Amino acid sequence: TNYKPVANHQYNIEYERKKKEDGKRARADKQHVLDMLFSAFEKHQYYNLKDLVDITKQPVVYLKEILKEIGVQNVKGIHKNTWELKPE
Amino acid sequence: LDLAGPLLAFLFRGMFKNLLKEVRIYAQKFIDRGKDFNLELAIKTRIISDGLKYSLATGNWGDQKKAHQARAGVSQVLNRLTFASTLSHLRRLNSPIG
Amino acid sequence: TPASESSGIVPQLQNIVSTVNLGCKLDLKTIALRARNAEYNPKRFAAVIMRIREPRTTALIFSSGKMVCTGAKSEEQSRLAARKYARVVQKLGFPAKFLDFKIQNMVGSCDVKFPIRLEGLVLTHQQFSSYEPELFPGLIYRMIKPRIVLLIFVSGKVVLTGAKVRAEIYEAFENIYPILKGFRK
Amino acid sequence: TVPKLYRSVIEDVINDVRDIFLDDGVDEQVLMELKTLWENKLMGQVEEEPLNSEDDVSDEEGQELFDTENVVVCQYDKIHRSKNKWKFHLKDGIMNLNGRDYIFSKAIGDAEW
Amino acid sequence: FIQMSVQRIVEDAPPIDLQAEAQHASGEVEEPPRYLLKFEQIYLSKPTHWERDGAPSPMMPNEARLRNLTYSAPLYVDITKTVIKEGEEQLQTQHQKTFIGKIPIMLRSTYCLLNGLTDRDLCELNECPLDPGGYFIINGSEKVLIA
Amino acid sequence: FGVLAKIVNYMKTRHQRGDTHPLTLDEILDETQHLDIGLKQKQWLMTEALVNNPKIEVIDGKYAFKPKYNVRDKKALLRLLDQHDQRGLGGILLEDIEEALPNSQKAVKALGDQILFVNR
Amino acid sequence: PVPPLSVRPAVVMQGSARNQDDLTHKLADIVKINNQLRRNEQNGAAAHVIA
Amino acid sequence: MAYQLYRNTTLGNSLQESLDELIQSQQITPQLALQVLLQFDKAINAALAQRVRNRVNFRGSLNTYRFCDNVWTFVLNDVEFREVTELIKVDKVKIVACD
Amino acid sequence: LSTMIGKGTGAASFDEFGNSKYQNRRTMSSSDRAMMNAFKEITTMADRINLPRNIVDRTNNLFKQVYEQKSLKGRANDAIASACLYIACRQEGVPRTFKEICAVSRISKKEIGRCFKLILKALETSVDLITTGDFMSRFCSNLCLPKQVQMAATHIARKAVELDLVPGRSPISVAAAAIYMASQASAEKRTQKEIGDIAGVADVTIRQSYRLIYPRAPDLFPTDFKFDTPVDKLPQL
């Protein structure tokens, strides 16, 4: 009925991965992050915020703080939301 | 005639499939998060353990909630009154009816 | 006091934790880049790490301008280290201040040099003691006199923490010593 | 042995930029001139901040200005420290010591500060 | 039912595979990981009981009735984990033998403890040699199925 | 595309600094150091991007700031509001602050003149 | 009309009151969803969800 | 992506100086010189991975250190480079490391 | 609270055009629906190591106290549930090692332990101290060791701790080395690796603990025991 380690072997693998570089994010340099948003706007008019944090590697509260500053939002159906850099 | 085997085969089959779905739900939620799979952690042993056990006890057949009213006396407490009631009761057989 | 001449040994200070606020916003990146004997890992942490050779110590300086200085074996060395750090920061052209220098934690240790009975100690002080060999090989005593935490070991070694002034260590130790002597194997 | 490696590198770089030179329409004589040049080159105050009473914690302005440092360029595998005890796991390295040329595929070290 | 049917059922045809979603908006460089689960031979241990101490021991039907236990036995299965992701790896496979549940034993069948014993052992165990068996013991109750 | 959003951000910053005076595309590209963004990008910016935006103020042969080409009068239309059969438009404070000046200076006089604030 | 307790007499059956009759269980939904329907309507409501 | 750091090398600088001459003579473009540097970078990275096979173990005193943008920069004094079949002592060395 | 509905009689039950017979049921206790989910995890885990319902009921009860206090709301229910299982098992006089509870839980040994100390303070309560006797049974039984070996093992364990031969050691390691000694003196010799695999302890931890007790091995056995091998012929590791 199985040996009892200190944690799951793989859990430790998960810990090791978390414990490799990735974790904290690069909130510094707004301009490069601004450029990245502009670059997002180079491919398509709107995106999911889940995708926006994935492509930027930044914290949500901050990505929101920026998106409040330079853009707007647009939701559809059941709280399905996309953001856009005010296309004109 | 559905004896012990055809009757049990039914009950255990439904439960093992129920357990197969439970491992799938568990493995799916983990894998959404990512990387830490444990097979032993996923199995809710109680699905088989309690499921056969409850049905053999109450008499209520099939899984609960929905269909169950189909069969009620598939199980009984063995009548130990004489030696013959035991022997006779073990060999009794029943037709489902109105 | 007579009760403090048996252990008359009086515990030795090993570590002090202090903080100080420079009172000004700082560019950690530039600081870290310019300074020698310094480390900054922004992708894994949010502050710059600094070390001097002298009273062998280390300090951590934050973007807010607050910093924490550790490693001194004395308040003088803590005042000495904080000032030395605040100096090099001044030397970075930033308006470094010595304002709000304060001791936050002190650690002490000593050796009573006798085998200790631990089942009794946990029995007699179940409302305070806790000893779990499965977690950590050493009994943890949470005193509320000068609200102090102690680590008591079978060897006789003792560590004390949670203090901000030396008197609390002697008081915590003067208090606990009779009990320890009374549980001597 | 290693001058050979630099030779290997000479062959690989020159060959891999031949086509690029060609794509620019530049003549192979310039490329040969490049190689020849390259080969020849190869050989309050009283309480708020009375800090000046602590001046100079430092022992020197710098060391890299002296150019007394034979240079080393390398990738790292692991960096470790335990107080004054530092541990280094380095890899894929190019050394130049007192004008002499050195290399390593892996290097492991320990050092005290 | 044991010698055939419970084997037949896990040896069905529903090997499950699971592929989490990847390249979530961006991506490129392979690997939406993929996992497959397979089931093998099934094992059934003679009917055991675990005390609150945690130590298992053999049960005997007379005990099962007095203390109101359920006379069941623990069931184990061989499970396999199998990764032939999109390319990087395929052979990493591991076999396990895992407890999945407890099935009630019919009394005096070949899986009961009573099935081999003579008249002397059964008199010894406190079970009547003349008892026909063939019925389950559930929470201390004799429960017989009806054809 | 992304350079046009950098131009709109610079023009928005010019109003936030205090100014709505019209400039050529060249004076914008020089102050934003996009003068060498490429002649093709400058041409597409001039003859499609500053043409596809209907909110740009065209004045003095030049382009000016930015969300309104008209009705930037920076005060409430009291005259329409006099007409109880047609009076109207309350709006969002953010558009009015965006329009020209901070609310507070105008508001001190307005708290005893016409304005009512609702926390909607 | 809400039947008085004598019509729904706390089935009891051991327990410590756990015998809050089943008609009471039906009444507890009726007040719950009605409490919810009155409060839903007090605020804003889509025409179909109130329906 | 391979690291530009080896462009800092004396060898790499000797290359850049050769290129600057060709640029001074205007026989090639600066952009082309930059392209030769990229190829040399890839080539020297490939060469290190494929050819180099020797290893060295070392001990010494640490004088000063730096860490920024995933790049470690040290300066050690009284260092001793030891190879399985060689010995090199040095008064001081600068070590730049990235990965 | 209340009731629920389902099915449809198979007659009218409109989806009218779409496929939704009459109406779907509704959730009712979402606010506390994670207390019931805690109980589901407690029972599942519990069955993996096959405790009686009485332990499981106290574990269930401990949790409800900690939850209502809200003093520990910041940590995962599965961490708090795993600690309850650990406390409950120890208070009931049948202690389980953290390594054991970690095996069945999805929470790491470190976090169950940290939660455990915090709950003791949270419920303003304390627990009994574990002894070697509490594990001697489970271990000797799972290795199919005769009752007689277990009895010796208990004695050896008990005597050793009385003699203070192991000043700073976990009771589990001491138990494990005692069992090994007993088993190597028995006919049913088991490897260090098997014991280590069951107790969770490293086989080197057994090696040290066995090395420390070995010099007094003759004096520790009970007089009733009959050797299979002389102690002058008991191997060293």
* Torsion of the alpha carbons at C83, C84, C87 and C91, rounded to the nearest 10: -170
Query: In this structure, how many other beta carbons lie within 10 angstroms of the beta carbon of residue C142?
Result: 15
Cβ-count burial of A88 within 10 angstroms (0-12 exposed, 13-18 middle, 19+ buried)? middle
Q: Which residues contact I7 (CB under 8 A, 6 or more apart)?
A: B66
Query: A48 with A76: CB under 8 angstroms?
Result: no
Q: DSSP readout, D4-64?
A: HHHHHHHHHHHHHHHHHHHHHT--HHHHHHHHHHHHHHH---TTT--GGGGTT--S-S-ST
Q: What are all long-range contacts of B55-58, with beta carbons under 8 Å and residues at least 24 apart?
A: B55/B11, B56/E104, B56/E136, B56/E138, B56/E143, B56/E145, B57/E138, B57/E139, B57/E141, B57/E143
The answer on C145 and C74 residing in a single domain is no
Chain E 94-133, CB below 8 Å of chain I: which residues?
99
Interface contact B40-E106, CB threshold 8 A: no
H37 φ/ψ sector (left φ>0, alpha ψ -120 to 50, else beta): alpha
Using CA coordinates, name the residue in chain C closest to I167.
C154
Residue B42, by phi and psi: left (phi above 0), alpha (psi -120 to 50) or beta? alpha
Is the separation of the CB atoms in I41 and I66 below 8 Å?
no
Token duo for residue E135? 């019925």
Give how far A51 is from chain E: nearest CA, Å.
Answer: 6
Distance CA C129, CA C122 (A): 5
Residue D11: partners with Cβ closer than 8 Å, 6 or more residues away: none
Q: How do D70-82 and H86-98 pair as beta strands?
A: parallel
Taking the C-alpha atoms of residue F9 and residue A86, their distance in angstroms, rounded to an integer, is 11
For testing contact with chain H, the best of C39, C56, C88 (most H CBs within 10 A) = C39
Written as six digits, the tokens of B30 are: 């983990």
Among the listed residues G49, H28, E94, F102, the one whose alpha carbon sits nearest the alpha carbon of residue D23:
H28
**Domain span including residue F40:** 1-72
Q: Which residue has the tokens 């499609």?
A: F48
- How far, in Å, CA of F62 to CA of B16, rounded? 77
Q: Which of residues 27-56 of E touch I (CB under 8 A)?
A: 50, 52-56
Q: Which amino acid is at I107?
A: I
What is the nearest CA distance from I150 to chain B, expressed in angstroms?
30
CB contact at 8 A, C44 and C14:
no
How far apart are alpha carbons D61 and C86 in whole angstroms? Answer: 18
Alpha-carbon distances, residue A13 vs A16, B37, B77, E20, E33 (angstroms):
5, 10, 53, 18, 16
> Do C47 and C81 belong to one domain?
yes
Query: What is the tally of structural domains in chain C?
Result: 2
Strand order in the sheet with A47-48: A47-48, A80-84, A72-76
Which residues are bridge partners to D83 per DSSP?
none
D81-90 long-range Cβ contacts below 8 angstroms, 24+ apart? D84/C56, D84/D112, D84/D113, D85/D110, D85/D112, D86/D110, D86/D111, D86/D112, D86/D113, D86/H62, D88/H58, D90/H97
In sequence order, which residues have a C-beta less than 8 Å from that of residue F40 and are 6 or more positions away?
none
Nearest to A7 among I48, I97, I102 (CB): I102
Separation between Cα atoms, residue I234 and residue I181, nearest integer Å? 9
Domain boundaries, position H10: 1-53
Nearest to E99 by CA among E72, E68, E59: E72
The reply to whether C114 and C148 lie within a common domain is: yes
How many CB atoms sit inside 10 A of residue G22's CB? Answer: 12
Q: Which amino acid is at G41?
A: E
| Same domain, yes or no: C114 and C182 | yes
Do C11 and C77 belong together in one domain?
no
| Residue F101 DSSP SS3 | coil
Domain boundary, last residue among H17, H36, H53: H53
Q: E146, B92 in Cβ contact below 8 A?
A: yes
Collect all residues from I whose CB is shorter than 8 A from any CB in G. Answer: 1-3, 28
Quick one: C77 and C37 in the same domain?
A: yes
Taking the C-alpha atoms of residue I214 and residue I180, their distance in angstroms, rounded to an integer, is 11
For residue D62, give the chain C residue with the closest CA: C36
Kindly determine whether residue B45 and residue I7, on different chains, have CB atoms separated by under 8 Å. Answer: no
Closest to F16 in 3D by CA, of F104, F113, F119, F102: F102
Q: Which two tokens stand for residue B78?
A: 């063995």
DSSP helix, strand, coil percent of chain F (3-state; round to 5) = 45, 5, 50
Phi, psi of I60 (to 5 degrees): -60, -45
Backbone angles phi, psi at C164, to 5 degrees: -115, -15
Could you tell me if D111 and H60 are in contact, meaning their C-beta atoms sit under 8 angstroms apart? yes
- What are A31's two structure tokens? 């301009």
Cα end-to-end distance, chain D, whole Å: 35
Domain map (residue ranges) of chain A: 22-84
Could B41 and I106 be called an inter-chain contact, meaning their C-beta atoms sit closer than 8 Å? yes
Question: Is C109:C158 a contact under the CB 8 Å cutoff?
Answer: yes
Alpha-carbon distance of I43 to I60, in angstroms, equals 9
Half-sphere exposure for I138 (CA within 13 Å, toward CB): 23
Q: Are residues F58 and F16 in the same domain?
A: yes
Residues H61 and H94 placed together within one structural domain of the fold: yes
* In a shared domain, residues H67 and H28: no
Provide CB contacts within 8 A for E108, sequence distance 6+. Answer: E114, E115, E131, E132, E133, E134
- Binding residue per annotation — C79? no
User: Any idea which residue has 């004390």 for tokens?
Assistant: C160
D80 assigned ligand-binding residue: yes
Q: Which two tokens stand for residue E38?
A: 């397979």
In terms of Cα–Cα distance, which of D66, D84, D79, D82 is closest to D107?
Answer: D79
Local structure of I133: helix, strand or coil: helix
- Smallest CA–CA distance, residue C161 to chain A, in Å, is 28
Q: Give the pairing type, strands H55-68 and D100-112.
A: parallel
Burial of B70 (0-12, 13-18, 19+ CB in 10 A): exposed
Nearest to F53 among A39, A42, A88 (CB): A88
Identify whether the C-beta of residue D5 lies closer than 8 Å to the C-beta of residue D13: no
Helices (H), B1-98: 4-33, 39-42, 46-58, 83-90
- Tell me, yes or no, if I29 comes closer than 8 A to chain E by beta carbon: no
F97 and F80 share one domain: yes
Q: Is E83 on the interface with B (CB under 8 A)?
A: no
Query: What DSSP character marks residue I66?
Result: H
Distance CA E32, CA H1 (A): 23
Which among C138, C128, C120 has a CA at the least distance from the CA of C180? C120
C181 & C115 share domain: yes
**Alpha carbons E147 and B6: distance in angstroms, whole number:** 9
Phi, psi of C38 (to 5 degrees): -145, 150
A48 with E99: Cβ contact below 8 A = no
Q: Which long-range contacts (C-beta less than 8 Å, at least 24 apart) are formed by E118-126?
A: E125/E60, E125/E62, E126/E60, E126/E62
What kind of experiment solved this structure? cryo-EM
Tell me the chain A residues in contact with residue B36 when contact means C-beta distances shorter than 8 Å: 8, 10-11, 13-14
The total number of structural domains that make up chain F: 2
Q: What phi and psi values does residue B38 have, to the nearest 5 degrees?
A: -130, 125
Strands C139-143, C48-52: pairing is: unpaired
Query: Domain span at residue D31?
Result: 1-43
Query: Residue type at I156?
Result: I
Distance, in Å, from the CA atom of I160 to the CA atom of I153, rounded to the nearest integer, reads: 10
Q: How many CA atoms lie within 13 A of C142 on its CB side?
A: 8
What one-letter code names the amino acid at G22? D
For residue C118, count CB atoms less than 10 angstroms from its CB and return exposed for 0-12, middle for 13-18, buried for 19 or more: buried
CA distances (Å), origin B73, targets A78, B61, B96, E144, I130 = 49, 9, 10, 10, 50
A13-43 exposure pattern, b = at least 16 Cβ within 10 A, e = fewer: ebeeeeeeeeeeeebeeeeebbebbbebbee
Which three-class secondary structure string do you get for chain A?
CCCCCCCCHHHHHHHHHHCCCCCCCCCCCHHHHHHHHHHHHHHCCCEEHHHHHHHHCCCHHHHHHHHHHHCEEEEECCCEEEEECCCC
> Looking at the domain A22-84, which fold is it?
Arc Repressor Mutant, subunit A (1.10.10)
Under 8 Å between Cβ of E55 and I52: no
- Give the count of beta carbons closer than 10 Å to the beta carbon of residue C102: 12
Amino acid at B71: R
d(CA C145, CA F26): 76
Residues 8..37 of G with a Cβ closer than 8 Å to I: which? 22, 25-26, 28-29, 32
Greatest Cα pair distance, chain F, in angstroms, is: 56
- Expressed as residue numbers, the domain containing C110 is 6-17+104-185
Q: Is F55 found in the same domain as F81?
A: no
CATH number reported for the structural domain that contains residue H95 in this entry? 2.30.18.10
E60 in Cβ contact with E113 (< 8 Å):
yes
Across-strand partners of G43? Answer: none
Q: How many CA atoms lie within 13 Å of B53's alpha carbon, on the beta-carbon side?
A: 18
Do C101 and C20 meet the contact criterion of CB atoms below 8 Å apart?
A: yes
What is the DSSP annotation of E6-59? HHHHHTSS--EEEE---S-SS--SS---EEEEEEEEEEE---EEE-TTS-EEE-
Last residue in a domain, options C103, C138, C153: C103
N residues, chain A: 88
A51 in contact with E, Cβ within 8 Å: yes
Closest CA to H7 of D36, D94, C159, D87: D94
Distances (CA, A) of G23 to G6, G12, G19, I8, I9: 12, 14, 11, 21, 21
The residue whose two tokens read 């009473």 is D53
C37 in H contact zone (CB under 8 Å): yes
Q: Please say whether the beta carbons of F37 and F10 come within 8 A.
A: no
- Identity of residue F22: P
Copy the structure tokens of residue F14.
Answer: 């010019």
Is the CB of C44 less than 8 angstroms away from the CB of A24?
A: yes
CA distance A5 to chain C (A): 13
Resolution stated for this PDB structure, in Å: 6.3
Find the CATH number of the domain harbouring D27. 1.10.287.100
How many CB contacts within 8 angstroms connect chain E with chain I?
Answer: 26
Whether there are 3 or more C-beta pairs closer than 8 Å between E and D is no
Residues C113 and C182 in one domain: yes
The domains located in chain I, with CATH, are 29-126 (1.10.472.10), 127-234 (1.10.472.10)
Among C103, C120, C145, the domain-final residue is: C103
Q: How far is C176 from chain D (nearest CA, A)?
A: 32
Report helix, strand or coil for C134: coil
Same domain, C29 and C92: yes
Give the whole-angstrom CA distance, residue I200 versus residue B18: 33
Does F64 share its domain with F89? Answer: no
Choose among D72, D78, D71: nearest CA to D104. D72
User: Do F79 and F67 belong together in one domain?
Assistant: no
Phi, psi of G28 (to 5 degrees): -70, -35
Whether F14 and F56 share a structural domain: yes
Best CA proximity match to E107, nearest among E93, E127, E89: E127
Side chain identity, residue C108: G
Q: Which residues, in sequence order, are bridge partners of residue D96?
A: D71, D101
